Design an enzyme around this catalytic site. Structure first.
Site, PDB file in Angstrom:
ATOM      1  N   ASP A 111      48.252  28.997  36.382  1.00 21.75           N
ATOM      2  CA  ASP A 111      47.051  29.381  35.859  1.00 21.75           C
ATOM      3  C   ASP A 111      46.921  30.860  34.554  1.00 21.75           C
ATOM      4  OD1 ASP A 111      44.798  29.938  36.613  1.00 21.75           O
ATOM      5  OD2 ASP A 111      45.234  31.229  39.010  1.00 21.75           O
ATOM      6  N   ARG A 115      42.130  36.648  33.048  1.00 27.73           N
ATOM      7  CA  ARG A 115      41.438  37.144  34.840  1.00 27.73           C
ATOM      8  C   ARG A 115      42.870  37.903  35.159  1.00 27.73           C
ATOM      9  NH1 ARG A 115      42.472  32.533  37.305  1.00 27.73           N
ATOM     10  NH2 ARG A 115      41.164  30.775  37.030  1.00 27.73           N
ATOM     11  N   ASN A 116      43.641  36.700  34.840  1.00 28.64           N
ATOM     12  CA  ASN A 116      45.497  37.260  35.052  1.00 28.64           C
ATOM     13  C   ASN A 116      46.249  37.616  34.584  1.00 28.64           C
ATOM     14  OD1 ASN A 116      44.449  35.660  38.101  1.00 28.64           O
ATOM     15  ND2 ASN A 116      45.359  33.967  36.721  1.00 28.64           N
ATOM     16  N   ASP A 129      49.724  37.806  37.933  1.00 31.14           N
ATOM     17  CA  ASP A 129      49.807  36.527  39.000  1.00 31.14           C
ATOM     18  C   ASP A 129      50.916  35.621  38.932  1.00 31.14           C
ATOM     19  OD1 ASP A 129      48.049  35.251  40.754  1.00 31.14           O
ATOM     20  OD2 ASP A 129      46.971  33.867  38.683  1.00 31.14           O
TER      21      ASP A 129
HETATM   22  C1  LIG Z   1      41.429  49.275  36.917  1.00 29.71           C
HETATM   23  O1  LIG Z   1      41.948  48.157  37.498  1.00 29.71           O
HETATM   24  C2  LIG Z   1      42.616  48.433  37.966  1.00 29.71           C
HETATM   25  O2  LIG Z   1      42.529  48.428  39.706  1.00 29.71           O
HETATM   26  N1  LIG Z   1      43.736  48.773  38.187  1.00 29.71           N
HETATM   27  C3  LIG Z   1      45.192  47.486  38.699  1.00 29.71           C
HETATM   28  N2  LIG Z   1      46.657  47.488  38.150  1.00 29.71           N
HETATM   29  C4  LIG Z   1      46.784  47.182  39.095  1.00 29.71           C
HETATM   30  C5  LIG Z   1      48.854  45.936  38.874  1.00 29.71           C
HETATM   31  C6  LIG Z   1      48.642  45.221  40.082  1.00 29.71           C
HETATM   32  C7  LIG Z   1      47.912  44.348  40.640  1.00 29.71           C
HETATM   33  S1  LIG Z   1      48.586  43.055  41.714  1.00 29.71           S
HETATM   34  C8  LIG Z   1      48.294  41.847  40.474  1.00 29.71           C
HETATM   35  N3  LIG Z   1      49.103  40.853  40.179  1.00 29.71           N
HETATM   36  N4  LIG Z   1      49.072  39.553  39.059  1.00 29.71           N
HETATM   37  C9  LIG Z   1      47.677  39.925  39.355  1.00 29.71           C
HETATM   38  C10 LIG Z   1      46.730  38.914  38.505  1.00 29.71           C
HETATM   39  C11 LIG Z   1      45.700  39.257  38.197  1.00 29.71           C
HETATM   40  C12 LIG Z   1      44.978  40.892  39.320  1.00 29.71           C
HETATM   41  C13 LIG Z   1      43.400  41.717  39.806  1.00 29.71           C
HETATM   42  C14 LIG Z   1      43.161  41.773  38.842  1.00 29.71           C
HETATM   43  C15 LIG Z   1      41.573  42.154  38.788  1.00 29.71           C
HETATM   44  C16 LIG Z   1      41.269  41.753  39.857  1.00 29.71           C
HETATM   45  F1  LIG Z   1      39.531  42.560  39.737  1.00 29.71           F
HETATM   46  C17 LIG Z   1      41.813  41.368  40.867  1.00 29.71           C
HETATM   47  C18 LIG Z   1      42.709  41.113  40.514  1.00 29.71           C
HETATM   48  N5  LIG Z   1      45.837  41.218  40.079  1.00 29.71           N
HETATM   49  N6  LIG Z   1      46.977  41.173  40.187  1.00 29.71           N
HETATM   50  C19 LIG Z   1      46.795  44.981  40.651  1.00 29.71           C
HETATM   51  C20 LIG Z   1      46.233  45.982  39.723  1.00 29.71           C
HETATM   52  N7  LIG Z   1      44.756  46.162  38.816  1.00 29.71           N
END
Ligand SMILES: COC(=O)Nc1nc2ccc(Sc3nnc4ccc(-c5ccc(F)cc5)nn34)cc2[nH]1
Length: 245
Positions: A111, A115-116, A129
């Site tokens: 995937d 976005r990931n 992701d």
């Molecule tokens: C200003 O953005 C942030 O909030 N900083 C941020 N740091 C992160 C550090 C880890 C994570 S958990 C994680 N592990 N693999 C993935 C793949 C995609 C996304 C994801 C991105 C965008 C969105 F809308 C929703 C989901 N998250 N994610 C989230 C985080 N978000």
């Protein structure tokens, strides 16, 4: 039971977690499984696993490094950012390097998409992701037909990811429906060359989308070719958003 002590940090959706270090925290025998192995996936262009919380008992909590700038897609879409061709190709060199690492571990992402991928405070891109933090919060022809995924189908995905980068986060095939993408592709079609995409980078996209999976470039090849294309730019070409997309 005791060989996991190097991963576990004791005494769903993701939350803002603390520890001073800013982390992101995702809400038991098989849990220590991927915990130890995901911990081994350490590379500058791959999202690290900082650790897991099991006490007492936890969710358990998968804890990851916080990414200042969020996901790559929202980042390039943001009208207040002013990326150059060089910056965007740079992001899609960093992703290739992360994937080169994953592929060397014979790990198939399945995937890959903008976005990931995440961007930290130094603008280093982290492929994300996967592992424990894998969830639903680009597919090769053969994958749509067999539901099988290989590193070669990750390469197809990467080609679409390069297209995303160069369109600054436009949806791929916007006027196309998901049920018939296979029919769409088999009519002899691919994504168009973005206005701000260098001819050689589009040739690279077309290679990622080769109809024969074995004829697609390895990620090692993609890192090599894209490092070259990248090196030719100096950051004078600004990429703007497409009115139609
Ligand atoms: C200003 O953005 C942030 O909030 N900083 C941020 N740091 C992160 C550090 C880890 C994570 S958990 C994680 N592990 N693999 C993935 C793949 C995609 C996304 C994801 C991105 C965008 C969105 F809308 C929703 C989901 N998250 N994610 C989230 C985080 N978000």
């Amino acid at each position: 039971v005791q060989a996991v002590q190097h991963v576990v940090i004791g005494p769903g959706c993701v939350y803002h977690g603390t520890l001073k270090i800013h982390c992101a925290v995702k809400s038991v025998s098989q849990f220590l499984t991927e915990g130890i192995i995901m911990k081994d996936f350490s590379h500058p262009n791959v999202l690290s696993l900082l650790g897991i919380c099991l006490r007492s008992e936890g969710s358990p909590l998968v804890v990851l490094p916080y990414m200042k700038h969020g996901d790559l897609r929202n980042f390039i879409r943001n009208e207040t950012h002013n990326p150059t061709v060089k910056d965007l190709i740079g992001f899609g060199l960093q992703v290739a390097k992360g994937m080169k690492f994953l592929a060397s571990k014979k790990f198939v992402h399945r995937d890959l998409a903008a976005r990931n991928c995440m961007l930290d405070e130094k603008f280093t891109v982290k492929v994300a992701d996967f592992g424990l933090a894998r969830d639903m919060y680009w597919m090769a022809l053969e994958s749509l037909q067999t539901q099988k995924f290989t590193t070669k189908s990750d390469v197809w995905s990467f080609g679409v990811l390069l297209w995303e980068l160069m369109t600054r986060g436009a949806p791929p095939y916007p006027d196309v429906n998901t049920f018939d993408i296979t029919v769409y592709l088999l009519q002899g079609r691919r994504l168009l060359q973005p206005e701000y995409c260098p001819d050689p980078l589009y040739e690279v996209m077309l290679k990622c989308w080769h109809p024969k999976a074995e004829m697609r470039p390895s990620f090692s090849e993609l890192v090599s070719r894209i490092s070259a294309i990248f090196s030719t730019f100096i950051g004078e070409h600004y990429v703007h958003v497409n009115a139609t997309y």
